[PDB]
Design a binder for these strands. Structure first.
Ligand SMILES: [Mg+2]
Ligand SMILES: [Mg+2]
Ligand SMILES: [Mg+2]
Ligand SMILES: [Mg+2]
Ligand SMILES: [Mg+2]
Ligand SMILES: [Mg+2]
Ligand SMILES: [Mg+2]
Ligand SMILES: [Mg+2]
Ligand SMILES: [Mg+2]
Ligand SMILES: [Mg+2]
Ligand SMILES: [Mg+2]
Ligand SMILES: [Mg+2]
Ligand SMILES: [Mg+2]
Ligand SMILES: [Mg+2]
Ligand SMILES: [Mg+2]
Ligand SMILES: [Mg+2]
Ligand SMILES: [Mg+2]
Ligand SMILES: [Mg+2]
Ligand SMILES: [Mg+2]
Ligand SMILES: [Mg+2]
Ligand SMILES: [Mg+2]
Ligand SMILES: [Mg+2]
Ligand SMILES: [Mg+2]
Ligand SMILES: [Mg+2]
Ligand SMILES: [Mg+2]
Ligand SMILES: [Mg+2]
Ligand SMILES: [Mg+2]
Ligand SMILES: [Mg+2]
Ligand SMILES: [Mg+2]
Ligand SMILES: [Mg+2]
Ligand SMILES: [Mg+2]
Ligand SMILES: [Mg+2]
Ligand SMILES: [Mg+2]
Ligand SMILES: [Mg+2]
Ligand SMILES: [Mg+2]
Ligand SMILES: [Mg+2]
Ligand SMILES: [Mg+2]
Ligand SMILES: [Mg+2]
Ligand SMILES: [Mg+2]
Ligand SMILES: [Mg+2]
Ligand SMILES: [Mg+2]
Ligand SMILES: [Mg+2]
Ligand SMILES: [Mg+2]
Ligand SMILES: [Mg+2]
Ligand SMILES: [Mg+2]
Ligand SMILES: [Mg+2]
Ligand SMILES: [Mg+2]
Ligand SMILES: [Mg+2]
Ligand SMILES: [Mg+2]
Ligand SMILES: [Mg+2]
Ligand SMILES: [Mg+2]
Ligand SMILES: [Mg+2]
Ligand SMILES: [Mg+2]
Ligand SMILES: [Mg+2]
Ligand SMILES: [Mg+2]
Ligand SMILES: [Mg+2]
Ligand SMILES: [Mg+2]
Ligand SMILES: [Mg+2]
Ligand SMILES: [Mg+2]
Ligand SMILES: [Mg+2]
Ligand SMILES: [Mg+2]
Ligand SMILES: [Mg+2]
Ligand SMILES: [Mg+2]
Ligand SMILES: [Mg+2]
Ligand SMILES: [Mg+2]
Ligand SMILES: [Mg+2]
Ligand SMILES: [Mg+2]
Ligand SMILES: [Mg+2]
Ligand SMILES: [Mg+2]
Ligand SMILES: [Mg+2]
Ligand SMILES: [Mg+2]
Ligand SMILES: [Mg+2]
Ligand SMILES: [Mg+2]
Ligand SMILES: [Mg+2]
Ligand SMILES: [Mg+2]
Ligand SMILES: [Mg+2]
Ligand SMILES: [Mg+2]
Ligand SMILES: [Mg+2]
Ligand SMILES: [Mg+2]
Ligand SMILES: [Mg+2]
Ligand SMILES: [Mg+2]
Ligand SMILES: [Mg+2]
Ligand SMILES: [Mg+2]
Ligand SMILES: [Mg+2]
Ligand SMILES: [Mg+2]
Ligand SMILES: [Mg+2]
Ligand SMILES: [Mg+2]
Ligand SMILES: [Mg+2]
Ligand SMILES: [Mg+2]
Ligand SMILES: [Mg+2]
Ligand SMILES: [Mg+2]
Ligand SMILES: [Mg+2]
Ligand SMILES: [Mg+2]
Ligand SMILES: [Mg+2]
Ligand SMILES: [Mg+2]
Ligand SMILES: [Mg+2]
Ligand SMILES: [Mg+2]
Ligand SMILES: [Mg+2]
Ligand SMILES: [Mg+2]
Ligand SMILES: [Mg+2]
Ligand SMILES: [Mg+2]
Ligand SMILES: [Mg+2]
Ligand SMILES: [Mg+2]
Ligand SMILES: [Mg+2]
Ligand SMILES: [Mg+2]
Ligand SMILES: [Mg+2]
Ligand SMILES: [Mg+2]
Ligand SMILES: [Mg+2]
Ligand SMILES: [Mg+2]
Ligand SMILES: [Mg+2]
Ligand SMILES: [Mg+2]
Ligand SMILES: [Mg+2]
Ligand SMILES: [Mg+2]
Ligand SMILES: [Mg+2]
Ligand SMILES: [Mg+2]
Ligand SMILES: [Mg+2]
Ligand SMILES: [Mg+2]
Ligand SMILES: [Mg+2]
Ligand SMILES: [Mg+2]
Ligand SMILES: [Mg+2]
Ligand SMILES: [Mg+2]
Ligand SMILES: [Mg+2]
Ligand SMILES: [Mg+2]
Ligand SMILES: [Mg+2]
Ligand SMILES: [Mg+2]
Ligand SMILES: [Mg+2]
Ligand SMILES: [Mg+2]
Ligand SMILES: [Mg+2]
Ligand SMILES: [Mg+2]
Ligand SMILES: [Mg+2]
Ligand SMILES: [Mg+2]
Ligand SMILES: [Mg+2]
Ligand SMILES: [Mg+2]
Ligand SMILES: [Mg+2]
Ligand SMILES: [Mg+2]
Ligand SMILES: [Mg+2]
Ligand SMILES: [Mg+2]
Ligand SMILES: [Mg+2]
Ligand SMILES: [Mg+2]
Ligand SMILES: [Mg+2]
Ligand SMILES: [Mg+2]
Ligand SMILES: [Mg+2]
Ligand SMILES: [Mg+2]
Ligand SMILES: [Mg+2]
Ligand SMILES: [Mg+2]
Ligand SMILES: [Mg+2]
Ligand SMILES: [Mg+2]
Ligand SMILES: [Mg+2]
Ligand SMILES: [Mg+2]
Ligand SMILES: [Mg+2]
Ligand SMILES: [Mg+2]
Ligand SMILES: [Mg+2]
Ligand SMILES: [Mg+2]
Ligand SMILES: [Mg+2]
Ligand SMILES: [Mg+2]
Ligand SMILES: [Mg+2]
Ligand SMILES: [Mg+2]
Ligand SMILES: [Mg+2]
Ligand SMILES: [Mg+2]
Ligand SMILES: [Mg+2]
Ligand SMILES: [Mg+2]
Ligand SMILES: [Mg+2]
Ligand SMILES: [Mg+2]
Ligand SMILES: [Mg+2]
Ligand SMILES: [Mg+2]
Ligand SMILES: [Mg+2]
Ligand SMILES: [Mg+2]
Ligand SMILES: [Mg+2]
Ligand SMILES: [Mg+2]
Ligand SMILES: [Mg+2]
Ligand SMILES: [Mg+2]
Ligand SMILES: [Mg+2]
Ligand SMILES: [Mg+2]
Ligand SMILES: [Mg+2]
Ligand SMILES: [Mg+2]
Ligand SMILES: [Mg+2]
Ligand SMILES: [Mg+2]
Ligand SMILES: [Mg+2]
Ligand SMILES: [Mg+2]
Ligand SMILES: [Mg+2]
Ligand SMILES: [Mg+2]
Ligand SMILES: [Mg+2]
Ligand SMILES: [Mg+2]
Ligand SMILES: [Mg+2]
Ligand SMILES: [Mg+2]
Ligand SMILES: [Mg+2]
Ligand SMILES: [Mg+2]
Ligand SMILES: [Mg+2]
Ligand SMILES: [Mg+2]
Ligand SMILES: [Mg+2]
Ligand SMILES: [Mg+2]
Ligand SMILES: [Mg+2]
Ligand SMILES: [Mg+2]
Ligand SMILES: [Mg+2]
Ligand SMILES: [Mg+2]
Ligand SMILES: [Mg+2]
Ligand SMILES: [Mg+2]
Ligand SMILES: [Mg+2]
Ligand SMILES: [Mg+2]
Ligand SMILES: [Mg+2]
Ligand SMILES: [Mg+2]
Ligand SMILES: [Mg+2]
Ligand SMILES: [Mg+2]
Ligand SMILES: [Mg+2]
Ligand SMILES: [Mg+2]
Ligand SMILES: [Mg+2]
Ligand SMILES: [Mg+2]
Ligand SMILES: [Mg+2]
Ligand SMILES: [Mg+2]
Lengths: 147, 97
RNA sequence: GGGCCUGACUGCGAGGCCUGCAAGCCGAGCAGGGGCGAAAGCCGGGCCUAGUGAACCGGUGGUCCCGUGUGGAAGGGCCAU
RNA sequence: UGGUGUUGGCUCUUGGUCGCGCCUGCGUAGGAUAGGUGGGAGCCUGUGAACCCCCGCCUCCGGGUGGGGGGGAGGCGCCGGUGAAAUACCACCCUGGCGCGGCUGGGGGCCUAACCCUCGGAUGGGGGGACAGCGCUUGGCGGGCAGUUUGACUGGGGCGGU
RNA sequence: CGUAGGGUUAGGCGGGACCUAAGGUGAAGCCGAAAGGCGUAGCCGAAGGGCAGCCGGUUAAUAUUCCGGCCCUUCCCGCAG
RNA sequence: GUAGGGAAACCGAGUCCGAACAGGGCGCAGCGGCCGCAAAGUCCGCGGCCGUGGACCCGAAACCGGGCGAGCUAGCCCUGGCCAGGGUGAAGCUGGGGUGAGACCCAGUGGAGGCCCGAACCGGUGGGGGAUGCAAACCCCUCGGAUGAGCUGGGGCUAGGAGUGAAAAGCUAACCGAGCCCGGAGAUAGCUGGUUCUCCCCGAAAUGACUUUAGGGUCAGCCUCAGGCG
RNA sequence: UGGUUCGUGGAGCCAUGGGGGAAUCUGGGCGGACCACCGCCUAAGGCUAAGUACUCCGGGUGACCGAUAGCGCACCAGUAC
RNA sequence: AGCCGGUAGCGGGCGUGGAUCCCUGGAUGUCCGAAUGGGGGAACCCGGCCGGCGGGAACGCCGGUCACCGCGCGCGCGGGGGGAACCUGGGGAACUGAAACAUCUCAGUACCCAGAGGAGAGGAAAGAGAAAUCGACUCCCUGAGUAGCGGCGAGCGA
């Protein structure tokens, strides 16, 4: 008997996968514990539609990122800060870079998404990765300058 | 011993024929019937219990139509069934046949 | 008692015996292919009268007759047992 | 009472079976232990040769194969010996056997959730448990019951005889 | 016996408007080709339980039933505690 | 009906067996004067006999289906009732005795029991009577039980291959080795019985063969009718 | 297993109690085991007048009865008993 | 043009202003019965709710209403029971015949049951079966006692 798993299951298969079990097992265990469903046509359709729908929203995100690589990776973020010689008085935070990025350049971003461990404390040219999606990592070149 | 709630399979009457002798096809003189008497052949009835709409419904059904009960459960998802009695649920289910 | 042999034939069969039926019995003669005999001829088991069992069902060998739209096949008929 | 449905999970042990890894084969003769039939005139080596010793494993008592260490640039071939067939190297496939696996057949253990019992309580607990019950089918035992049969002749009938 | 006419009077006797027994029936539920068979509750079911009337008089014919005397039961309403 | 023969293919006044042009089986072939006449055959009527039906009528014991019965009787269940009077005198208990204590013995008290005698009541032993009865089981005399496995009222349950049975194949509504009613049904009866006006002609058989046959049948023999022969 | 003429037969067809178990016309069932060929037909949903059967009922008609007949009943009979 | 049933009599009435009588429709229609408020030993008994009557609260009577199951959203609709044969479906004998008897016959008959209806069933090819064919079903004649089936018996029979 073919069923569709509703969960990962010890040496049987993975969720959404279609396996063949003895009808007793399906009827008297798997189905009553909500662990699986009959591989009927009427719910094979549905599984197909779920795989369909997930894959729509995955590649749709992997575009919303990729297209956001286009808006960044083609600019430099220039941040004027009060500083002497090369060391800054205050600092440039991620929360700053994000607030900077909207004001000029237009793009709105999430500070927390940006890969900045400790607030930048020296003037110069920085190359900072964004990660708005795993597998789609972005290069934000940021020039921190004086005045 | 009785009637399939799904297929309508019911006990039927059959003869039990007793024979002695060697078939012609095997070079024997032929089969002789030493007895014919009536008997019944029953459906292979079994119980099938299922939760549908938070209630426990049970069917007495021929083994051949055991899958037909579960298919009925599937078709039942499209129904306002909650709060009915199990007699009433079973009726809605059967009505789907 | 001995020699050669397989007629302990195949296809038939005039005419009879017996007889409720069904059976049983005797059988010259013609044809085919033979045996013995120089030939006449004899040989279709045994000097004779008992040693047997109808039909049905089935087996085996043959025949190549039927073969369920057609060609086959299954299965049967027929001759022998 | 066998098979099969209702009838499921895990495990161990055996048996069949394919799918691999494999190792494996000892007549006269021929160096040596020659399974077949091709492809074959070359293959191997810092992906360290000739050979020195310790472990497994089969062992026709001669070895074979598998590991470890030095040594670390050598070894077998085609030819020729040679036998029905002859050598390195690559395959397609056998004898037997081994370990993973599929798939199974038989046994053993365990599980629970079908099914059965049970619990003032119940979409639950407890117990039995894929047995038992029940369907289809197999063969058997079966005057408990059923339908019947159980001859004729005959100095009556039986017995005897026929 | 035929024809006709009369005659059987109850809150308290008996049974019902009370209870349950065996059994019967039977929501729930179970089973069986059909008919139907079962089935805790409930219901029915008495000569068992429960419940208030004794004595006398009267008619041709009834009387614990009518009458007379002395007693009593439940139900409804009210008043009082 | 007009063609038969052959298991058949198939051939056809032939065909089958067969090598046969052999032999054989089974088949094939009107009267008168073109006219009439008769005829194959076939249709209808009538009659005899045959087959199938219940098949000439009446008769079983039985078998099967579906119902009706436990107001009789049998067992059980629920609930009530009954059992005069008399007798015997268990255990226990009390007291006396006994002993180390006891067992135990005696007395009194007590009132046991499928105990005794005997009515009601329940039976039915032996005899007599009855015998078209008073009675389809009674009567008289006698006799068994009579606190029990007792008897009995009411209310219930179990039935036909079934019940019930202290068991007799007993009883289940006056006949139970399988109840009764209706139905299958006009079961079947190779047996018994019965079979109805008249006259005229003829006129048997009781044997043989075979027969789960023997008092029943088939064939033959023997009777009779019609046609033909002579 | 039943149905059919078909009783296991060479046994198909239709139906179906058990087990197994498809496909959507390039699908399927059938023409008497089976195979090929050649054909026929479209299973697993339902309905459908009429022509057919019967006679409680009404009428018509008898080479049907005539009170032991004809219905069990001509009548107060499914009665008395 | 008579009439008040068979049915006369007593004792009273009716009808040409059309009686009796016949036909159609309506009204009334105790109780029991499927019987259905509940019970029950049919034709009796006992209730709930609304309304009415009596002096009426107890008590009683009168009218209405109250069973169960199915289907459809408490309410609607329907069911239930009967009918001589006929009909379909679910079950289904035996005597008997086979001159014994078991397969076979009787017979899918008798009979039980369910259901229908004035009929019922069947019916518009996954047919037939050899015709290059036909064209739903039913029913009659014939095909035919054929083909076949059959302890290849008795018989059965498209
Ligand atoms: Mg059988
Ligand atoms: Mg055979
Ligand atoms: Mg053969
Ligand atoms: Mg046979
Ligand atoms: Mg189950
Ligand atoms: Mg099946
Ligand atoms: Mg299955
Ligand atoms: Mg010679
Ligand atoms: Mg002769
Ligand atoms: Mg003769
Ligand atoms: Mg010669
Ligand atoms: Mg010669
Ligand atoms: Mg010579
Ligand atoms: Mg001669
Ligand atoms: Mg001699
Ligand atoms: Mg001799
Ligand atoms: Mg002879
Ligand atoms: Mg015979
Ligand atoms: Mg014979
Ligand atoms: Mg033969
Ligand atoms: Mg053919
Ligand atoms: Mg031929
Ligand atoms: Mg064919
Ligand atoms: Mg060919
Ligand atoms: Mg041919
Ligand atoms: Mg061939
Ligand atoms: Mg042949
Ligand atoms: Mg042959
Ligand atoms: Mg012969
Ligand atoms: Mg078995
Ligand atoms: Mg099993
Ligand atoms: Mg365990
Ligand atoms: Mg457990
Ligand atoms: Mg459990
Ligand atoms: Mg255990
Ligand atoms: Mg089991
Ligand atoms: Mg079961
Ligand atoms: Mg089997
Ligand atoms: Mg058996
Ligand atoms: Mg016997
Ligand atoms: Mg025996
Ligand atoms: Mg007996
Ligand atoms: Mg008999
Ligand atoms: Mg015998
Ligand atoms: Mg005998
Ligand atoms: Mg005798
Ligand atoms: Mg004698
Ligand atoms: Mg004699
Ligand atoms: Mg004599
Ligand atoms: Mg004598
Ligand atoms: Mg004598
Ligand atoms: Mg003898
Ligand atoms: Mg008087
Ligand atoms: Mg008074
Ligand atoms: Mg009252
Ligand atoms: Mg009462
Ligand atoms: Mg009560
Ligand atoms: Mg009952
Ligand atoms: Mg009860
Ligand atoms: Mg009450
Ligand atoms: Mg009382
Ligand atoms: Mg009382
Ligand atoms: Mg009272
Ligand atoms: Mg009283
Ligand atoms: Mg008083
Ligand atoms: Mg008096
Ligand atoms: Mg009086
Ligand atoms: Mg008074
Ligand atoms: Mg007050
Ligand atoms: Mg000739
Ligand atoms: Mg003429
Ligand atoms: Mg004529
Ligand atoms: Mg005759
Ligand atoms: Mg007849
Ligand atoms: Mg007759
Ligand atoms: Mg006759
Ligand atoms: Mg008779
Ligand atoms: Mg009798
Ligand atoms: Mg008998
Ligand atoms: Mg009997
Ligand atoms: Mg009977
Ligand atoms: Mg009976
Ligand atoms: Mg009694
Ligand atoms: Mg009695
Ligand atoms: Mg009592
Ligand atoms: Mg007494
Ligand atoms: Mg006494
Ligand atoms: Mg006394
Ligand atoms: Mg005492
Ligand atoms: Mg003392
Ligand atoms: Mg004393
Ligand atoms: Mg005393
Ligand atoms: Mg005493
Ligand atoms: Mg006594
Ligand atoms: Mg006594
Ligand atoms: Mg006395
Ligand atoms: Mg007294
Ligand atoms: Mg008495
Ligand atoms: Mg007695
Ligand atoms: Mg006496
Ligand atoms: Mg005496
Ligand atoms: Mg006497
Ligand atoms: Mg006497
Ligand atoms: Mg006497
Ligand atoms: Mg007498
Ligand atoms: Mg006396
Ligand atoms: Mg006495
Ligand atoms: Mg006495
Ligand atoms: Mg005495
Ligand atoms: Mg006594
Ligand atoms: Mg006494
Ligand atoms: Mg006494
Ligand atoms: Mg006594
Ligand atoms: Mg007692
Ligand atoms: Mg008593
Ligand atoms: Mg009593
Ligand atoms: Mg009584
Ligand atoms: Mg009694
Ligand atoms: Mg009893
Ligand atoms: Mg009874
Ligand atoms: Mg009865
Ligand atoms: Mg009986
Ligand atoms: Mg008995
Ligand atoms: Mg007794
Ligand atoms: Mg009687
Ligand atoms: Mg009797
Ligand atoms: Mg009696
Ligand atoms: Mg008697
Ligand atoms: Mg009997
Ligand atoms: Mg009997
Ligand atoms: Mg009847
Ligand atoms: Mg009959
Ligand atoms: Mg008859
Ligand atoms: Mg007889
Ligand atoms: Mg007799
Ligand atoms: Mg006569
Ligand atoms: Mg004379
Ligand atoms: Mg004789
Ligand atoms: Mg004979
Ligand atoms: Mg004989
Ligand atoms: Mg004989
Ligand atoms: Mg006889
Ligand atoms: Mg004769
Ligand atoms: Mg003569
Ligand atoms: Mg004659
Ligand atoms: Mg003459
Ligand atoms: Mg089949
Ligand atoms: Mg059949
Ligand atoms: Mg045959
Ligand atoms: Mg067939
Ligand atoms: Mg099936
Ligand atoms: Mg096709
Ligand atoms: Mg296809
Ligand atoms: Mg088909
Ligand atoms: Mg087929
Ligand atoms: Mg076919
Ligand atoms: Mg066809
Ligand atoms: Mg067709
Ligand atoms: Mg229809
Ligand atoms: Mg029309
Ligand atoms: Mg019609
Ligand atoms: Mg008519
Ligand atoms: Mg009429
Ligand atoms: Mg007349
Ligand atoms: Mg008369
Ligand atoms: Mg009469
Ligand atoms: Mg007269
Ligand atoms: Mg009449
Ligand atoms: Mg009469
Ligand atoms: Mg009369
Ligand atoms: Mg009368
Ligand atoms: Mg009058
Ligand atoms: Mg007057
Ligand atoms: Mg007058
Ligand atoms: Mg007028
Ligand atoms: Mg009217
Ligand atoms: Mg009134
Ligand atoms: Mg009424
Ligand atoms: Mg009522
Ligand atoms: Mg009622
Ligand atoms: Mg009322
Ligand atoms: Mg009121
Ligand atoms: Mg007043
Ligand atoms: Mg009032
Ligand atoms: Mg009222
Ligand atoms: Mg009905
Ligand atoms: Mg009706
Ligand atoms: Mg039928
Ligand atoms: Mg039915
Ligand atoms: Mg049937
Ligand atoms: Mg029966
Ligand atoms: Mg019979
Ligand atoms: Mg008969
Ligand atoms: Mg006969
Ligand atoms: Mg017979
Ligand atoms: Mg006979
Ligand atoms: Mg006999
Ligand atoms: Mg018989
Ligand atoms: Mg007959
Ligand atoms: Mg039949
Ligand atoms: Mg029938
Ligand atoms: Mg009839
Ligand atoms: Mg009806
Ligand atoms: Mg009509
Ligand atoms: Mg119609
Ligand atoms: Mg219709
Ligand atoms: Mg159509
Ligand atoms: Mg013809
Ligand atoms: Mg028949």
């Amino acid at each position: 008997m073919k069923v569709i798993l509703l969960e990962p299951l010890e040496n049987l298969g993975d969720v959404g996968q279609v396996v063949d079990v003895k009808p007793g097992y399906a009827r008297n265990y798997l189905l009553p514990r909500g662990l699986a469903v009959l591989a009927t046509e009427s719910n094979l359709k549905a599984l197909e539609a779920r795989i369909r729908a997930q894959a729509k929203r995955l590649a749709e995100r992997k575009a919303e990122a990729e297209r956001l690589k286009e808006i960044l990776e083609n600019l430099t973020l220039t941040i004027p800060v009060r500083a002497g010689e090369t060391k800054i008085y205050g600092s440039v935070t991620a929360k700053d870079i994000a607030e900077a990025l909207s004001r000029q350049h237009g793009v709105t971003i999430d500070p927390k998404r940006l890969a900045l461990e400790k607030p930048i404390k020296e003037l110069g040219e920085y190359v900072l990765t964004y990660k708005p999606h795993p597998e789609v990592p972005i290069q934000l070149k940021v020039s921190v300058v004086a005045q | 011993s009785k009637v399939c709630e799904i297929s309508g399979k019911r006990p039927i009457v059959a003869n039990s024929i007793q024979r002695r002798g060697k078939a012609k096809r095997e070079g024997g003189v032929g089969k002789k019937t030493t007895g014919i008497s009536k008997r019944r052949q029953y459906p292979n009835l079994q119980k099938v219990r299922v939760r549908v709409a938070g209630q426990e419904i049970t069917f007495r059904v021929a083994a051949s139509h055991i899958p037909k009960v579960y298919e009925l459960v599937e078709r039942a998802k499209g129904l306002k069934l909650e709060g009915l009695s199990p007699k009433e649920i079973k009726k809605e289910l059967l009505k789907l046949l």
